[PDB]
Amino acid sequence: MSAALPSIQLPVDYNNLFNEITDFLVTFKQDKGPKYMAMLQKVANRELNSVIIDLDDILQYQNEKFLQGTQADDLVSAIQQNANHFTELFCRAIDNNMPLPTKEIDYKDDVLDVILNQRRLRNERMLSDRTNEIRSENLMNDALREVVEDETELFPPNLTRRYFLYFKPLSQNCARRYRISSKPLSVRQIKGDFLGQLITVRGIITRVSDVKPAVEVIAYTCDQCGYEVFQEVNSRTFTPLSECTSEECSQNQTKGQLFMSTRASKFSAFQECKIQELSQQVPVGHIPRSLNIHVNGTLVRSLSPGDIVDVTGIFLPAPYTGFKALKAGLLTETYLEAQFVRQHKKKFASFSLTSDVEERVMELITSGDVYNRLAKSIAPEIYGNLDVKKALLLLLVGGVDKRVGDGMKIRGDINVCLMGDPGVAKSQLLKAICKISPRGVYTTGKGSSGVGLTAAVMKDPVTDEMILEGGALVLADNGICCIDEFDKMDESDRTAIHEVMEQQTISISKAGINTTLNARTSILAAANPLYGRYNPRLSPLDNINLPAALLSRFDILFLMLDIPSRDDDEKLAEHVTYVHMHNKQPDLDFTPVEPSKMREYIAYAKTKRPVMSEAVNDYVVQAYIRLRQDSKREMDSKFSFGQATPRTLLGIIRLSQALAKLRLADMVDIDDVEEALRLVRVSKESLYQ
Amino acid sequence: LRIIWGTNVSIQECTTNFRNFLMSFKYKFRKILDERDEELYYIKQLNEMRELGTSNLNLDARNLLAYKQTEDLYHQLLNYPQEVISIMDQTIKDCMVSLIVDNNLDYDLDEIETKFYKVRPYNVGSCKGMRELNPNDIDKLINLKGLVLRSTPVIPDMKVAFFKCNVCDHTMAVEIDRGVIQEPARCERIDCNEPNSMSLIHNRCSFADKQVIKLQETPDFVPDGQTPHSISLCVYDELVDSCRAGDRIEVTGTFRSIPIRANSRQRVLKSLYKTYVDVVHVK
Ligand SMILES: Nc1ncnc2c1ncn2[C@@H]1O[C@H](COP(=O)(O)OP(=O)(O)O)[C@@H](O)[C@H]1O
Ligand SMILES: [Zn+2]
Ligand SMILES: [Zn+2]
């Protein structure tokens, strides 16, 4: 009954789009030589493992056809649909045309690349013997060679597949140039019926699983045959094909047993994550709902929690429906199979220099005064006070981590408080540094903050294990944690914080948790005195509520407090009314730097590891003793605060390192510490106004 | 030329190459390895072992890396350990016997003919714990630095199964092959046949000791973002009650994967495999 499975047809014709691909992979020189062939030589060199295909080239390839009057038969409008077909057929061409191996097979190589080599060799010997036996049996290539191919049975090319293939879309630039394909959609905006399409979505990667192997093919061994049995695994589950299906046992009485091989079984690296909606894209009154993303292969570690990404990939059903009764038939779950990733705040750990990034650093330097240029370029939407914002740049670059080579470590990081009264904005600076910091995080005084500053423990949804889930100080690391309403925290919060400023680690010893945990965070804090504003009749140790032991772990505190004045408040009222009249910042003979290029500059400065001259070494000491002698012997009355400490000497060193790194300089001058000491003292000269 | 399937290993060529090393090594790492008296460096430690009965040969793997003629092997035992250590079990016995026959000796022969010798290779390179162990690393030598949080009871695991026959006064035994007990339906027919009537008797069988240990793993570096992992690992006989809660350890073994049964009802297996270490050495 051919009225069942009724025949239909559509404008596509895959049987000649494959004929298009087999030209594109070799017929492209708009950017060694036909680069895909040379890239496949590096696969034939066995020095890379993943193939990235960009629509940027396919479009300009069709222009080289269309402007020559040659039919396009568009791949791009097809490929944004149905990519699970192309991604398993576009790869077939590459098996059928790739260069031969050049660096000959050797012991220092990854073990999978000989297992595949042996089967690929065995494949050809089977043809070589069967052809000769057929020829020898008492009697043309295209005639004979097809007999060999059909009578033989062989390893399939997907099981000899050396590599994983992925796609990336074309950016809007290439869509408007030559005049769709990838709007970065909201998780709400996805409207369901995009199933099948290649889509771009952006949002917070809240939670990830660990990477583990998940099988795609099971290989089974049969002794009595010697033939392998391969089972493709497609769903979440499989049943062992224990009954031997072999071509030698099928027409045989005995049906002898088989055993799985746990290295001949082709795996893939499997990882998955939630993306929650990006909050500013949520409608009024609605909630940031979540979507499930599945990952395969080489891409797997590109997603890390607490970061914002574009994910590009193919959006697909999964067979699940609820629990039988809560059903209305043929429902599906859905997931996104990730293909390529880009992330709007980048990882510092990748920073190498190439033809476009060095000039973005160099054009920033050559105007000079870089340190003051960047301080004013931090948060230029709030008035003046440069000394605070100038120190926030040092908080980012952070100084130098020191390991003693003898079992000791001392913090290469800056911890700061922004004490003051209302009206001189705080959270705006906290929020501004959360954006400019990759891995930046924002926090608040009360509620969840016990667990929120701590490891939870969680039964991991996708797989049967417990995991520690990181609070803010662990969701952030190697980056800034921002604290607000600070003194409205509580002892259980402080005694977590107080350890983290002192050293890079946290320790827990309640219930199922006994670990020692790496923090590696910079704490930048906003706090208010006991009465919101200061009282001049109260000495700072009484005006401030914080205990001086914790305060001594702030390497700088800023007494950033307001006093009314006839002139100074006028220029502020100009800046606020100007920036409220329109978005733009003042018409100074200046430009506030774009943050992403400043992030690149910082990521280069972070690579610098400066050394202190003996000239400054002996100067830092003598300044310290005069500071410490003054601080103790004179300053323990009236407006006097605290005490000078070894820790504040190390603060001056770390700040002096930071300045030298902002110079991009391999050594630390006497000119640096005479600036660092100024920021230390100036933060409280405000108090005399 | 002979070769193992899927593999780069020639038995006899590795056999002679290991002997050539075993009968000629003298701290060449101090000479060669980096910018850093003795002689016969292993022969003293082999002729040490034979009177003590300590059947274990603890091996500093980096002896081979520096040495001139077994760079060809370091990257094999690292990558094919289940098979390459199965070679070493044989070569060392033959290399013990060469120290018999060159000696006027008492009757060491009457047991070392039958007894078995093994290798524990530990001195291998560093790794980022569980995390860098992508599936390309399945079934390879590995090491971990860390500590123990708990250890299970000792588990009985089958090594010879026993069969009792409900009639006719003959039993049967079968050795386990790669995780199966192929129980004969036929009553060992040549005595007589009854189609299906035979038993399996628990308390006659021969068992391994097995033990499982939970390791809190602590790498020399961890990426920004990470949190501690509780790996689960397994240890066999002669290592049971070697190490226990609170010990700080370097351990080495084979990284593995295994399925899990979804439920106690039916043989459906989860496709997202579980992973563990089979311990071969603990320092
Ligand atoms: N000096 C300034 N320049 C520009 N805007 C300011 C300034 N001071 C305050 N503001 C405005 O006031 C708000 C700051 O509130 P803020 O004082 O940070 O709350 P808190 O009392 O918690 O610190 C911001 O919205 C900002 O626009
Ligand atoms: Zn078979
Ligand atoms: Zn019987």
Swiss-Prot record, chain A:
Keywords: ATP-binding, Cell cycle, Cytoplasm, DNA replication, DNA-binding, Helicase, Hydrolase, Nucleotide-binding, Nucleus, Phosphoprotein
GO molecular function: ATP binding; ATP hydrolysis activity; chromatin binding; DNA replication origin binding; MCM complex binding; single-stranded DNA helicase activity
Zinc is among the record's keywords: no
Subcellular location: Cytoplasm; Nucleus
CDD domains (alphabetical): MCM7
Alphabetical GO biological process terms: DNA replication; DNA replication initiation; DNA strand elongation involved in DNA replication; double-strand break repair via break-induced replication; nuclear DNA replication; pre-replicative complex assembly involved in nuclear cell cycle DNA replication; premeiotic DNA replication; silent mating-type cassette heterochromatin formation
Binding site for ATP 2: R553, R647
Protein known as: DNA replication licensing factor MCM7
Organism this protein belongs to: Saccharomyces cerevisiae (strain ATCC 204508 / S288c) (Baker's yeast)
Origin organism lineage: Eukaryota, Fungi, Dikarya, Ascomycota, Saccharomycotina
Curated annotation (Swiss-Prot), chain B:
Assigned GO CC terms: CMG complex; cytoplasm; DNA replication preinitiation complex; MCM complex; MCM core complex; nuclear pre-replicative complex; nuclear replication fork; nucleoplasm
Keywords: ATP-binding, Cell cycle, DNA replication, DNA-binding, Helicase, Hydrolase, Nucleotide-binding, Nucleus, Phosphoprotein
GO molecular function: ATP binding; ATP hydrolysis activity; DNA helicase activity; DNA replication origin binding; helicase activity; single-stranded DNA binding
Record-level GO BP terms: DNA replication; DNA replication initiation; DNA strand elongation involved in DNA replication; double-strand break repair via break-induced replication; mitotic DNA replication initiation; nuclear DNA replication; pre-replicative complex assembly involved in nuclear cell cycle DNA replication; premeiotic DNA replication
Protein location: Nucleus
Function: Acts as a component of the MCM2-7 complex (MCM complex) which is the putative replicative helicase essential for 'once per cell cycle' DNA replication initiation and elongation in eukaryotic cells. The active ATPase sites in the MCM2-7 ring are formed through the interaction surfaces of two neighboring subunits such that a critical structure of a conserved arginine finger motif is provided in trans relative to the ATP-binding site of the Walker A box of the adjacent subunit. The six ATPase active sites, however, are likely to contribute differentially to the complex helicase activity.
Miscellaneous notes: Present with 8800 molecules/cell in log phase SD medium.
Record text on subunit structure and interactions: Component of the MCM2-7 complex. The complex forms a toroidal hexameric ring with the proposed subunit order MCM2-MCM6-MCM4-MCM7-MCM3-MCM5; loaded onto DNA, forms a head-head double hexamer.
Similarity comment text for this entry: Belongs to the MCM family.
Name this protein carries in UniProt: DNA replication licensing factor MCM4
Source species of the chain: Saccharomyces cerevisiae (strain ATCC 204508 / S288c)
Lineage: Eukaryota, Fungi, Dikarya, Ascomycota, Saccharomycotina
Portion of the parent chain present: 177 to 467 of 933
